[PDB]
């Protein structure tokens, strides 16, 4: 499952599309708050395009529920997370993910 809990809303006149590319600054975490990665450690935003399966499905079906210029929280369940195997290095097996993504730009 994916849950979106808005902290700061943005303008609702624009929404991301499937063919659009979103540029965001994100600070991922885990279930217990142990931060694992961020997009502010490096001074460069992270870009990804919907439709194709390069991000986990949780991101794909959660960011679509957001709006432009809205900073929110996500709690990605293990179902839509890296699965039973888990990404080697960071994410352990059966690990609920917590994210703090903030959309910045479209295309």
């Amino acid at each position: 499952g994916v849950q979106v809990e808005t902290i700061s809303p943005g303008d609702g006149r624009t929404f991301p599309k499937r063919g659009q590319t979103c540029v965001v600054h994100y600070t991922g975490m885990l279930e217990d708050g142990k931060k694992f990665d961020s997009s502010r450690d490096r001074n460069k935003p992270f870009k990804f395009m919907l439709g194709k399966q390069e991000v986990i499905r949780g991101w794909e079906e959660g960011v679509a529920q957001m709006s432009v210029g809205q900073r929110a929280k996500l709690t990605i369940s293990p179902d839509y997370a890296y699965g039973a195997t888990g990404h080697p290095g960071i994410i352990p097996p059966h690990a609920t993910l917590v994210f703090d993504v903030e959309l910045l730009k479209l295309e």
Binding site: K35, S38, R42, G89
Partner: protein, 350 residues
């Protein structure tokens, strides 16, 4: 080829086999200029430096005695280059004395380098620099955080064990000028007078609760203006109120207490002014600019000279890049190699 972009300096690939870093009193300037280029040291040399630091720190009293003209600095949390900028800002250790308070290891990718440099300069300078124990020098927290992986990737786990057995002996009270008391965390209701922090056993891992587990984990009230009330932020120690600190200062003749937990945008904070004397009773100092690369906080460093308290601000400095959890790019990119190759081939075949 050999190097696609040549602007980035190449990290030196040779470790130092105690030939140059020791003259025994060690050499500081070459150690600084070697570790500032992401160099490295041999395992035996690092173990020797840490062991000598532990040996020279074990003889230290629980409550240090420090004279008047001093410089006080907050926690670091592994930022090596910010530490070097701090040394540059505060002057050479030869002409001034320091009082380091906070933790040195967790939440940073240059922790082993920072602890090595600090303890080497401690070996060279034994009376003009005093280190204090923090809240992040335990087995539990460091195993939880990214210090164990630092030691494993850079050195062997024996370095980790030696560094922990060396943290085991740090002092924790550090009285200053018999007028100011400097503890890393805060007061505890269990501790009544200064003698209580003059006799307790400090050579052990902190327990679940007690005097030493509360001195490093306590925290002043965060919403003043709304004694032993429990902590929700940490969950392991208590608060203390303005009447509590007032009673402690009245029982034992002092003026103020200093601490280095609360990361602050301003870098320094003076809590409620003492109406009896006019000077603030609790001081919070943070000396790690750009904490976690997201806080964007200007650090602060205090100086006490000629019976004058003053605060100097502190800026940031660039540092190199590391991958989270120290992945090597093969482990970083291989799951995105296999998936893409298999996707293309399944697409072509069917």
């Amino acid at each position: 080829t050999d190097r696609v972009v040549k602007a980035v300096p190449f990290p030196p690939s040779h470790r130092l086999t105690a030939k140059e870093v020791f003259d025994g009193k060690p050499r500081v300037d070459i150690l600084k200029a070697h570790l500032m280029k992401e160099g490295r040291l041999e395992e035996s040399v690092a173990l020797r430096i840490i062991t000598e630091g532990a040996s020279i720190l074990r003889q230290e009293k629980n409550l240090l005695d420090i004279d008047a003209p001093v410089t006080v600095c907050g926690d670091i949390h592994g930022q090596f280059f910010d530490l070097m900028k701090l040394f540059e800002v505060g002057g050479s250790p030869a002409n001034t004395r320091y009082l380091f308070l906070g933790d040195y290891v967790d939440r940073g990718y240059f922790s082993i380098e920072c602890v090595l440099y600090l303890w080497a300069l401690k070996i060279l300078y034994p009376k003009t620099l005093f280190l204090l124990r923090g809240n992040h020098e335990c087995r539990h927290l460091t195993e939880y955080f990214t210090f164990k992986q630092e030691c494993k990737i850079k050195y062997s786990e024996r370095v980790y064990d030696a560094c922990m057995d060396a943290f085991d002996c740090l002092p924790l009270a550090a009285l200053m000028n018999q007028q100011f008391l400097c503890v890393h965390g805060g007061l505890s209701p269990e501790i009544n007078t200064l003698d209580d922090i003059r006799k307790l056993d400090r050579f052990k891992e902190p327990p679940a609760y007690g005097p030493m587990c509360d001195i490093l984990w306590s925290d002043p009230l965060e919403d003043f203006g709304n004694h032993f009330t429990h902590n929700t932020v940490r969950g392991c120690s208590y608060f203390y109120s303005y009447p509590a600190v007032c009673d402690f200062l009245q029982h034992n003749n002092l003026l103020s207490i200093l601490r280095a937990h609360e990361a602050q945008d301003a870098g320094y904070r003076m809590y409620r002014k003492s109406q009896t004397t006019g000077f603030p009773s609790l001081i919070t100092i943070f000396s790690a600019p750009n904490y976690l690369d997201v806080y964007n906080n200007k650090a602060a460093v205090l100086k006490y000279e000629n019976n004058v308290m003053n605060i100097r601000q502190f800026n940031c400095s660039p540092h190199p890049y590391w991958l989270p959890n120290f992945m090597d790019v093969f482990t970083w990119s291989l799951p995105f190699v296999g998936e893409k190759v298999t996707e293309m081939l399944v697409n072509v075949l069917n």
